[model samples]
Target: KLPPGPTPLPVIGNILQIGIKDISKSLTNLSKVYGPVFTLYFGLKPIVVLHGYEAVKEALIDLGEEFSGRGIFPLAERANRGFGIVFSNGKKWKEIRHFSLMTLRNFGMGKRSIEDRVQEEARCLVEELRKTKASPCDPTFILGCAPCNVICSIIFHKRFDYKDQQFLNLMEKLNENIKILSSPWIQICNNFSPIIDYFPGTHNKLLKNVAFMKSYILEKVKEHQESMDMNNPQDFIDCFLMKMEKEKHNQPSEFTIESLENTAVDLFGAGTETTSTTLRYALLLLLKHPEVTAKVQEEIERVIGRNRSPCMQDRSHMPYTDAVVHEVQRYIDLLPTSLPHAVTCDIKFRNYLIPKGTTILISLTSVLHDNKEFPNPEMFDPHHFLDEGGNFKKSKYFMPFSAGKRICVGEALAGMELFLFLTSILQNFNLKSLVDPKNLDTTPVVNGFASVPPFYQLCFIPIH
Candidate 1:
């Protein structure tokens, strides 16, 4: 009751008080007014919101297990049966999460072999863009395809050709479904589940979208099961199959075909959208900030010569370039609050007793953009991540992947992709604005859940 927040009304609670194009911005504003620890209500449920580095760190890291329960998505819960690690909490979550990490590691995650695959895809991406003759083209589609190919190679032990019909269909479906999931109507439906079931409105579309995604994943699972070789496990699917077999006799077995399918969907869903959106913003930021783009390109050329492709290991030697990558993630704050967190037990903070099961909203965007922690939090400054010696510096506040027990499973993979793809593009081309930089809008278009930049084109002039 002592939590710092506005007084709520009867039905809407504090929903009407929130105002911004994106949830991240709105939450940041709320934290400014209500202090780091605050409370809001979605309908009648009391939600505790944490802001800035200290607050998020305390809850997510210091008091980690006290807030380990996942904020369940009603639709995802039903579709996946809580089979996937993202939605599952407690022991089930722990087991599946560890297994997935091990399996991915076995499949060459965090290894040079994985980097080679990414470089290969980067070459393909560059080739596709080159075919356009460096015309004013939206590289979003190509960017999305590259990371998806990386995930596919890890999962299926194969890469899809750019023109492959099935792969194209899957990508399109994923984009559409992700867009649908982010809609306000869908959020409303998720909150008021009973109304959604009886009303027959946008909820129907959400159901259809989920079914499409599930069906596609299930088909892949069936195919893998048919031709899987137990002796030599080739990909993520093969590794997962081996686990399912090993764990078959174990009681309360969480390793099933259903779990495998959902895990694959999670890898695709989480991996594809987040990585692509970050790259999309990276390019947009470069277009708007030509001086910054030129500086980054200079660093790329100075460190890694034009003749060689950029690799993840090159980040160490290229401090400015690495700082630019970190700054992009911080400035954009892609996932915003990321997935909402749920309280695992009753916890007290700031003299207020937060009851068990209270929804905890950790605004990562707020932490990254906190003015106290970052000098010019509002502006894009790669220097924030650089030392006086021009070496890349890691801050305690950078939580793009969040922190603690429930941090993103794909953080390592995402970091690799962001560095490699960004460096690769900057090395080959100098990004320039087609229109006036001042006229370029940084306003994000609300696409369902994710907030992305509006339709803007740029000229990618090759640096010869």
Candidate 2:
């Protein structure tokens, strides 16, 4: 039997009770009454909501295989048609995820070469910020371009100029889609897709953008195809093409032009906004808490002076900086309720039988802000990640990337980008807020699917 939960009404179900303003808070509140493991209805569908670290860990970690299935994401399903790493399931998800992970690692995802790419990109970002001339500027597009270019270098074997029109357009579209996908209407559409999809809205624009991106990826794939070099693989596309040739005769092969297009879009889409948003939010948080910012800057100065680019190796020696980064991710609580997880087969979990095909919602907010684990959860404190000796404290509760088998495929790459980009910036400049540090608002502008940092501008005053 499904776990106990609030009674559901017809058609709309518990959505009326839960409301749309902040589903995570509402669901977390519900858990207080109904327990951590409880069912919540979205429209006619029944989704099991897993709140708190114990429940989330039990399902996602203890019984990972049972809960490894990807749940429905209406927009992604429509855009990908179950073809790519982000949305596919069963054998498809397995093959594509493994291949993508392996290929990314080989292309230097966790290796020194990838660090070099990030270091080079960080240098480029510093130069771009230097052009601001200590004047106040919004970092939305500029910050977006940095991570986007890191992924670009891996996928296309090249990076675009920040001012390039095509690159700017792509970044704009990706940013738009991230906001659109998390909008209330989009969330509602996910629950009531059949009816809501028929109505006119931003979702159409989302599809339009998705198609444009797919075409762009296809164009790149075609370019790589024409310049095929079996003896040497230049980038992700080239590596994928070689794999396609190797598996051409294998019927029902996962490697195909269609899969390639969708996966490329997946890599680019997943790779860009998430890390950039975190970096953007990190800057906002640092701007709000100048003391924290000063300490990180001090760490940067002491460990790796302003003379050279900061690399992944530097992260080990810089405990305070590392703790600040951890605290930033933990405090922001991005993706409060992570992407849905599902059970592949009926399974008994904590004395409840979750039937096959039941959707699961893991309340990441519950874990990140658990009062028992993080004292005064509302406050932003880097000390949360630092122990008595001042070394970085690794908490099991630190799960901005989520956890378990369905954990983000770009986890390593994102980590490298965040550390390198943030350290590089702090190394060269002293962040000067346009407003008083205390007056700066660090609340996220949007809090669905992802927690987007509010719009703010700061002056990047050169340290020298």
Candidate 3:
């Protein structure tokens, strides 16, 4: 049984059934007719969708390697291709994923170097926010700069001024691409079967956005190459350039410029955009619930006490803050329909017959919004992540990071970034929305990746 589900009519496509915005709700509805491990389709092709915590776990975790495969269309279909960490599949994916994950490991769950960089960037973000002097300002685009610079530090060993043209342009295109990707035409055309580019469209614009990113990265790599010493490889680019030299002559060398470029692209796109958006969403969540924000601020003041930079060391002790952040991720459900996965080879899953290379999509809402597990699942409550004693409690189902073999590589990194960024700001400022907390509309502008809240100004009222 390949489970069961809705049929894709010949006239219409996935969009008629599967929408491009906040799709988890649709999938949640579909899951009612079809059981958890069912098949949905694009046109006539069958794509597997795993709903619920148990079903998702059965495939991604229990099955592991079988479901570890990366399924792609728009990126893998036309503009973006293999190599790098996020989009790549098969042998090269394994090799590159391993190397990139190893080399980039910083904060322990990640390690020290990233924390130091985050600490430095924390100061930079604060200074940037400080320029506002507590007046109302849109923190959205400004938040983009800090997260991008953090990844850029590792990729190119450089950070950009918020006013830098190159940085601003890159963020604009990246964001445009992010918004455009959620458009119905883009998904219907891009993720449709046979991997069609579906004539020229915003998908083309998306291709160019990525093209611009590669070109930008190559220039950075060129700069690093001219300045880097092999003995003193300064950053990601330096290390990658050095590795290429060592494996340049190998027959199956995965150390090509394209690979390095794609890897940098992945680091920038995955690393920068998601966390920054989450930070933006976190601020919205705080503003939506003042009590939550006030509690986090009070908890931080009590535990950290306006002394040194917020560190990973503070995370365990700051249970309320941790619970709040965790709940934001869970409530927002960043990737409601997570990045598609596939079964590399066929296997009997609960007697379900799914073929090799079948595209797998999970209805993340099922896990994040399960009523029995989290009482009043739709409401924003940190208690979902806390116990009776008010200590932070980890749930097996609290998987905003997804799970299993190809779970978000940025999970650890993003965790550190969110914790540090949130605490740093709350420690320094009193966040106030332009509207009343109850009146503030917290609806997300849905994209395929994450549901970003609509644009709004927030004042970072200085507490210091």
Q: Of 1 and 3, which scores higher on lDDT?
A: 3
**Candidate 2 residue pairs that clash:** none
Worst 10 residues of 2 by lDDT: 106-115
Candidate that would win on lDDT = 2
In the predicted model 3, the residue pairs found to clash are 1-352, 106-110, 106-111, 107-110, 107-111, 108-111
State residue 376's C-alpha deviation in candidate 1, in Å.
1.6
- Per-structure clash totals for the candidates: 3, 0, 6
For each candidate in the order shown, give its overall lDDT on alpha carbons: 0.77, 0.83, 0.80
- Per-residue lDDT tens digits for candidate 2, residues 1-464, read 89999999988888779847777888988988999899988877889999999999989999999999888756554444467987788899999999888877835332336677788899999999999999999998788899999888888777899988878878888888876666666665464765345534565677788788888888888898898877777778888888888997897799988888888878877898888889999999988888888899888888898677887888999999998888888888888988888899999998799999899999888999988889998788999989999999899998888889999998888888999999989888889888887777787654445577788999999987
Q: After superposition, how far is residue 222 of candidate 3 from its true place, in Å?
A: 2.3
Task: In angstroms, give how far residue 384 of model 1 lies from its true place.
Answer: 1.2
Where does the lowest 10-residue lDDT sum fall in candidate 3?
103-112
TM-score of each: 0.92, 0.95, 0.93
| lDDT assessment of candidate 2 | 0.83
For model 2, state the Cα shift of residue 67 in Å: 0.5
Q: Which ten residues in a row have the lowest lDDT in candidate 1?
A: 194-203
Residue by residue across 341-435, what tens digits does model 3's lDDT show?
Answer: 87899878885788898889977778988998998987889999998999999898888878888988878778988999899999899988887
